[PDB]
Every structure is written in structure tokens, then in C-alpha cells.
Amino acid sequence: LVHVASVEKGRSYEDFQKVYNAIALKLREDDEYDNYIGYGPVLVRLAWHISGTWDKHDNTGGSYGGTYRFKKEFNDPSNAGLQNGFKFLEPIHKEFPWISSGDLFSLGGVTAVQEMQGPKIPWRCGRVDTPEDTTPDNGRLPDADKDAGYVRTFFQRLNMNDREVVALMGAHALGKTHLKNSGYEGGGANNVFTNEFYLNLLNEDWKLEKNDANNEQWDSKSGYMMLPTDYSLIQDPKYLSIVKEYANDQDKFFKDFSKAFEKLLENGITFPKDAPSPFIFKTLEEQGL
Ligand code: HEM
Ligand SMILES: CN1C=C(N)C=CC1
């Protein structure tokens, strides 16, 4: 199964920087969401979930087709809460009806990471909306109650190695868990992209507790929480080395996250050799906006 990137007719960098800017300005405006976290974190999670359906074995799923717009995927229990991100993006799509759905969802995540002071994440256009019958079944996104071996195996389906997994997981510095979405809860409120996920793993005094949904999670006094799968990154010796590396090198973390996140958002897509180079968007701050 081959998905060839096809640039939205006539469009160029500048068109996409205007979409980026509309997303970024809305992120600034709609500040009250989720007790003033704002929409950044949910948009990152949306971009990941629309991509994380991909299966390297047959090229099913993935960001290309924009299939989250269809009820089977929209209603996946693994996607509970992402409707908030979709509804944030609806007026953006209204304004720029020419962008594909996969382009919009993925660009939302890039815009969120950057506006949250994260690394620059190069982004390529040309995902093309595919029909309802191409929507992947539920059950392709990962469970949170499992161990390191589960995480490692899971991510092989997405063609991600240990470093890529540990880097991607650093997004769990952002936002929070909500009991009614996932059966996990914490006092998370962070909307600045940093390496503090790794610092927190190493430096906090973690307690394995049961939450109000009767699920186990790791809690600290300071208010942080880690899923079992997060904590597994310090229970496995190979993951632990990489957690230490990122806890000790913010720039390396940024660089590795950028590469892994772009890769995640591009898995399954064939870029023609005369496709445009990846775009690196300016932040609102860089533009004086
Ligand atoms: C083993 C892999 C992973 C598991 C089991 C997992 C699980 C979860 C769970 C259960 C939540 C809480 C959802 C809710 O209650 O609203 C969550 C939130 C989140 N996840 Fe993951 N996740 C994983 C990987 C990732 C990756 C790879 C990224 C992106 C690079 C990501 C980004 C996020 C973000 C940004 C949030 C916060 C959402 C918000 O604040 O609304 N996750 N994750
Ligand atoms: C703040 N967050 C904490 C986690 N353990 C997972 C997602 C987000």
C-alpha cells in the first residue's frame, strides 16, 4: 500500500505558515481550556494518535489519510478527549478549507510543540484525505498499564527504536491525565516543552498507588504522576541510560524529539524526489506577532 504525498494545488511555504499562525494565534486566545493549560498538549496528543495507528507491515493507518474525521476512529476509546483538539481545529479548517485533514492534524502538533517553546520540528505537506473504508480499526494505540517489554514491542510496529521511544515519551511532560478519558489522573498543568519528564522520573520520590478508577499509577508529593509505561523507562536498564542522557542534555533531547516526532508524523508517506523540502515554520514570537 503506497501513499504518495501530493502538495495542495498551488500551495507553498507561505500558505502553510499562515495556517501555522492561525493555529498559534488561537492557542494564545483560547487560554482557559483545561484549567488554563490551553490546547497545546491535547494538540500534540492528537497528532500522535492520528499517526500512531500506523502499521509498518502493511502501511495501514498513519497520518496520511486523515481518517480521525470518521466516527470509528473519532470514537476509539483510546482517543477519548481528543475531540477537544478536533473542535479547536475546526475553525482553522473552515478558514483554510484547502488543507487536508492529515496535514491539519499533524501541523497542529508541530505548531503546539513550537509555540510551547519546544524544538523546531520540520514538517512536510501533502497528506491526502482517503475514504471512510480506509479508517483503521480501534486497538492500535498503546495501553498504559504495561511494562518495558510491552512498550518496546509496541513501538517496533511504528518502526521506532529505544532512543526514539524514550525521546517521544518526553511529551508526557505536557498537559495531564484525566480520569474520565483514560482512567488515570494527576495534577499536571505544564504547557512549556522541556526535558522535565526525565528529570522528574529520576529525581522524584515515586509511590505506586491506586487511583479512583482502581488503576495503578506512580505518584509523587510534588503532584507529578507517571503511568506504568512511563515508569518502565527507569525499570529497564536500556531505557534508563537514555532517560539519564536526556535529563542531562536539554539540547540533545530537543534534537532527538524533533527527529522522532517528524518521523512519527511522516510514517507511511512516500515523498516524491521533487517534493518540496520540509518546512520549518517561524513561531509567532520570531515573527513579532
Ligand atoms: C506507551 C506509550 C504511551 C501511552 C501508554 C500513553 C498514554 C497516555 C495517557 C493514558 C494519557 C492521558 C489521556 C487523558 O486522560 O486525557 C496521555 C496523555 C498525553 N500523551 Fe501519551 N501515551 C504514550 C505515548 C505518547 C507519545 C509518543 C506522545 C507524543 C509524542 C504522547 C503525548 C501525550 C500528551 C501531550 C498527553 C497529554 C494530553 C492532554 O493534556 O490532554 N503520548 N498519554
Ligand atoms: C502530564 N502527563 C503525565 C503523564 N504521566 C502522561 C501524560 C501527561
TrEMBL record:
Q: Which UniProt keywords apply?
A: Heme, Iron, Membrane, Metal-binding, Mitochondrion, Oxidoreductase, Peroxidase, Transit peptide, Transmembrane, Transmembrane helix
Reactions catalysed, semicolon-separated, are: 2 Fe(II)-[cytochrome c] + H2O2 + 2 H(+) = 2 Fe(III)-[cytochrome c] + 2 H2O
Q: What is its EC number?
A: 1.11.1.-
Domain Plant heme peroxidase family profile, first and last residues per copy: 99-289
Q: Does the keyword Kinase apply?
A: no
Any single biological process term in GO: response to reactive oxygen species
**Gene Ontology CC terms, in alphabetical order:** mitochondrial intermembrane space; mitochondrial matrix
Q: Where in the cell is it found?
A: Mitochondrion intermembrane space; Mitochondrion matrix
**Which top EC class is named for this enzyme in its record?**
oxidoreductase
Listed GO MF terms: cytochrome-c peroxidase activity; heme binding; metal ion binding
Q: Where does this protein chiefly localize?
A: mitochondrion
> Which residues does the record give as heme b binding sites?
R45, W48, H172, K176, H178, N181, S182
Functional note? Destroys radicals which are normally produced within the cells and which are toxic to biological systems.
Q: Which family does it belong to?
A: Belongs to the peroxidase family. Cytochrome c peroxidase subfamily.
Assembly with partners or alone:
Forms a one-to-one complex with cytochrome c.
Q: This chain belongs to which protein, by name?
A: Peroxidase
Which residues of the parent chain are present? 72 to 362 of 362
